[PDB]
Symmetry: D2
Subunit: 342 residues, 4 copies
């Protein structure tokens, strides 16, 4: 049974602790947070073997097989490296690193230590996205894909740390674009990126970008748009569409649950908006890919099944994003090398 | 670990066999069918310990804890009774019985043998329906429920046995109305039915009803409509709405997956319609409540946890349907006793 | 140019006055209301030739060709009869009469005086409903219709007069069922009703019914449901569906405008709900059939074109409703004669 | 009464002829086409005073007040100029010109002859778009707009002339982008474009672009996307969304009619797709803005009311598109001057 430690007992510590507690092949062994009280609380909610106040002792404890890192972005690099050196397998929430060189360093490392390194690209394990991908891959029906667009918009992360560059490593392009890039590439069966073009906005007053458009040109001729926002009210939106020479496919995560409700007051267990017509969620964690993702990882560790979707994909997406940042700065379409296309 | 036998290796044998193979607390031990080849097919598909050609030997085998009965409706009664007598726990696909007295007999028989009897009201375990129910139960927001309507329509069951009365026990009202009634009652927290009114149609030519409307009046004042059809082209529809003094809630199972696709041809693993704009399914079996239902039953048998939604609910719905059949015959709104309002 | 008088300058006086003011073949000549100030206001809004304080003088004035009666239901009968006797053509808002015998009396009368009598079944002139009907009539595609359902729900009429039986003539079955029955019959090309079955509710506390289901059996085998409510929050709903042996057709009036908006506050020109996700309206009057309806009537009067959809249809629907009331009272399915089917 | 001539009796000649025949303040006086038979067809369909075989005689006839030009794009410039010189008011289908200089020339020429020149930006007169614009303009509710995206996709124009550069003047970016740009600018109350960035595709084989993305940066900080395609199967899509600091607004023209239908075959007067689930149209011409646009123009000519949306807006959009073509060539974000940001 894969013995698991959660590192950072906030929102995603919580989600991963739920999924782990429910997996018959794993045991939620430990929870650690800089804030010992948040660690104890989460340890009790999901019946963890214990709360570990010490990172040092955590890493030394040979009873742990795997660490799930759900701390702020800027910590991911250092914490994952220490972890892999200590001999633990590691699942890191996105973004795996804050730059391509950070990511590449972790990949090098995991391999040196013969450990599983996985990253939190949960959507790529969302069952409705898995289906979407099979439909685009049905060449008789869909023909050849030529457009893919992934939209990811919300009213922005609440946590204080997501507003500082050192702790967040970036604004909306990094926070949400990682997911969108990775979804475009994967929806097209790991398509090779030839060029990248991006423009960023700062919508909210005085700074990290809170909105972005990034466009990729792929080898096979197709074009990928990633449209990403921290400044969209009205409820999170996660949608994709793919268009081929014969077909079309659309995916809708948050308004594709087939539930609607209306109240004046607001329903007790419905996030936002509260009042009026809403689209309540059912099994949002599963729908979003977290159970399958973590299940894949538990399986990789439990018995050396390499990962369907590996950290090389995180390197690729990191390069895209870094090239996007630079495309914006220079107002130009760019190769991943960084050089202008012309 | 709960050792399981599937009886009837057709479409729902297939579904239950999938759910059982995937449950860590159970083992798919056997598959049996009148057609030994269909049983072997399914046994291999889901890695069943074995294919049992013999009903007799199936029921005698003390390695089996639980039977799932997925045969034609007319057989359910007889098969479930023999099964409970043989000492096995049993989950029967709907409709549990073909009449209220058949259903009552099974419930009481299960009790005699101290067995868990469950029935296949899978939608009552559908996670999106469970969530719809919580929202209607949120009184501050929803207020008091006064209308519930469940719609269940398809182009009708293809199997020959579903067209004959003896093997099917009834037409669309029994086939689909069982689900719809049971959902109206449950969405309103086991609401008491005071009257029943129904009209049936024969749309497709020379006979079992193809289409029906059944309406219930509940104790609290609310009205429930069940609108049910074997003659709707264009893709199955499963749908509910509940309306209160303050709120509204709507549930859409098959066109509420958040997936759409278009092709001229038709996509490989997408049902009907094939061509043009479709609404592909993801995790249909889960979404429909089968995993949670069978899970509930596995749990009841395995670690003696009583069933959340028991077979008395099948008796209640059976009475509603039998009163609906009679309402139609007499052109009158009726009490469950059978007497006219 | 057809010279028009509006009688009752409230909400529907307002709508009809707009449509009339915009019709090149008519002239908004006069507005009359028991409340002379409401008449003057509406006369000014839509540039009416004058405000007429006297019903007597209104009816005697030979400059008026047509009267549009937008007063409370209970007045329709008497006002339309006086009008037709005075020699005026008449368009009466629904329900044309409060009972079948009232309606039959008006039909008799209009014919005696060789006048056009029309009733406010506007939806039957809604362009999206006209299309729906053509699609069901396309027998190759649709086959034979076997189900039609029309749903009509709102949070109920606000006017004081709609709560008293003498002034309203009935509750939700009469107010909304008239529209629904008439839509079912017309969507099926004037289908003959064989039986009627209905059950009514009183949802709001202490009385007129505020919710109803009525079901019709038609000659050709099809079944019609009319589901009608004064107790549905969240915005008016007007939907229909028709199902045949080959086809299906769905119509959505209020959430089929293809406009959506979100705000916290509420948009200035959007009715209800105010806040959160709404479905704003564009050209609601036209979409609802009022321009076409009134246009048909203006044409019938302007040049004796008999009406596509005549007051005989109002008699038929009145009989259905009266039979529905009785079906409810007796708990039985009934023939229009009133006799039980068995 | 405004006496009107239609030039080019194909699809849009047909549409404009319908709108004109129905306007009480105008008279459909003439129809002309290179193909005299197509002109006669259309003249009879909409009861035109006559079919004019001769362009020369058409322009000389002093009974005509206004010409509507619905010929292939390459002809617009020449035909509109001859028309304005002949003393006629003119409405030209998009794209008004094939380049900014062509457009500028016409505007100035119209002025010399004191004529109304309008262009076919019909969607800017679409009642549901007019309403979308009012909601974005409601500052308390919407806040400040920061994103606008207009999507315009179809399976591409069937006419041969639209595949050749000389007759079409451009591919999808010019054909559909003109509409999309003009809608982004107008939905934001005539927002000033500061930069333009675009990438084009050739999806269908050996050439004019089939597909494009064009992005504008506006003065106020907002960003506009125009996503345009000749290679999308499954039915035309026209769609916009605008996102502010507080609100959101979404507009859907072709799948926002509130009509759906299913058949195995296909419904008589329903376009593409034919079979399976479709979204039948009602009043498409009105919904698309043609009646209000032509009404505006009839009014301008008839009773000297200036145009709400004038041809300067066609110049602005033409500059955006020409800068987009150049952006694509150079792989760079560009100012309208042509210079790199
Ligand atoms: N895939 C997805 O959908 C999502 C991913 N995330 C990602 O998950 C990660 C965590 O996100 P959340 O929203 O933040 O949870 P958060 O802000 O709720 O929690 C952070 C937790 O980590 C603790 N912490 C901070 N620094 C620490 C350190 N150096 N050592 C140990 N513990 C420390 C804090 O006390 C806190 O309990 C982020 O990388 C974010 O990108 C977040 C939300 C959704
Ligand atoms: N939960 C749900 O939504 C649904 C439930 N059902 C129910 O599932 C049950 C089975 O339906 P399907 O699998 O659709 O039909 P099916 O025809 O697809 O399968 C029936 C199987 O039982 C076999 N069989 C017949 N006589 C037998 C006997 N005497 N002993 C053993 N096996 C025999 C048949 O050859 C066939 O293999 C029915 O009661 C139906 O009411 C069906 C569809 C959906
Ligand atoms: N087809 C449709 O969608 C609709 C139809 N209606 C119908 O229109 C009619 C009027 O409805 P509204 O909502 O009421 O407007 P309302 O209540 O706003 O106005 C009634 C007006 O008539 C005046 N009035 C009352 N009695 C009068 C009399 N005896 N003589 C002259 N004037 C008198 C009042 O002072 C008032 O101005 C009703 O029959 C109602 O069913 C109403 C709303 C929508
Ligand atoms: N507002 C909108 O959304 C749309 C606008 N259009 C525009 O409408 C215009 C016409 O397009 P369609 O009618 O689709 O093409 P079409 O091919 O359907 O019609 C063009 C007509 O002009 C005729 N013609 C060719 N050379 C001629 C000449 N020298 N003199 C007179 N007539 C001649 C052709 O034979 C044909 O009858 C195009 O500029 C296109 O940009 C087209 C589709 C939609
Ligand atoms: N308002 C709903 C919800 O907003 C936050 O949580 C949401 C998360 O923020 C949201 O994560 C998205 O947004 C995060 C913030 O931009 C991204 O870092 C992340 O990659 C993305 O998936 C996730 N997919 C849905 C989840 N429900 C917030 N953490 C949660 O407590 C609150 O209840
Ligand atoms: N909340 C929107 C609106 O509600 C009332 O007006 C609605 C009308 O009540 C509504 O009429 C429906 O409801 C009326 C009340 O039940 C029925 O008598 C009528 O036959 C039906 O069409 C109409 N189709 C739509 C119209 N917008 C109300 N008169 C109006 O002022 C208010 O602005």
């Amino acid at each position: 049974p894969v013995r698991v430690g959660v590192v950072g007992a906030g929102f995603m510590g919580g989600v991963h602790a739920e999924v782990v507690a429910a997996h018959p092949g794993a045991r939620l062994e430990a929870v650690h947070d800089l804030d010992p009280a948040a660690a104890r609380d989460l340890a009790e909610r999901f019946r963890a073997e214990r709360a570990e106040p010490s990172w040092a002792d955590l890493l030394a404890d040979p009873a742990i097989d795997l660490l799930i890192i759900t701390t702020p972005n800027g910590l991911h690099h250092r914490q994952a490296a220490e972890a892999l050196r200590a001999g633990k397998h590691v699942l890191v929430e996105k973004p795996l690193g804050v730059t391509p060189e950070q990511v590449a360093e972790l990949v090098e490392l995991a391999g040196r230590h013969d450990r599983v390194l996985a990253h939190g690209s949960n959507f790529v394990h969302s069952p409705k996205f898995v289906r979407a991908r099979q439909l685009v891959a049905d060449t008789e029906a869909f023909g050849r894909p030529h457009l893919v667009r992934v939209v990811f918009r919300n009213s922005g992360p609440e946590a204080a740390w997501a507003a500082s560059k050192d702790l967040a490593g970036g604004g909306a392009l990094l926070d949400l674009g990682c997911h969108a890039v990775e979804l475009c590439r994967w929806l097209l069966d790991g398509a090779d990126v030839e060029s990248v073009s991006a423009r960023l906005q700062r919508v909210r007053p005085p700074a990290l970008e809170d909105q972005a458009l990034l466009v990729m040109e792929f080898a096979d001729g197709a074009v990928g748009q990633c449209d990403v926002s921290w400044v969209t009210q009205g409820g999170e939106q996660v949608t994709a569409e793919i268009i081929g020479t014969k077909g079309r496919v659309e995916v809708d995560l948050w308004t594709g649950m087939g539930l609607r409700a209306y109240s004046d007051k607001g329903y007790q267990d419905v996030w936002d908006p509260e009042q009026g017509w809403v689209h309540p969620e059912w099994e949002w964690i599963r729908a979003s890919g977290y159970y399958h993702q973590d299940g894949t990882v538990i399986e990789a560790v439990g018995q050396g099944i390499p990962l369907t979707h590996g950290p090389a994909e995180a390197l690729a997406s990191a390069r895209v994003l870094a090239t996007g940042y630079r495309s914006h700065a220079e107002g130009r379409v760019l190769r991943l090398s960084g050089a202008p296309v012309g």
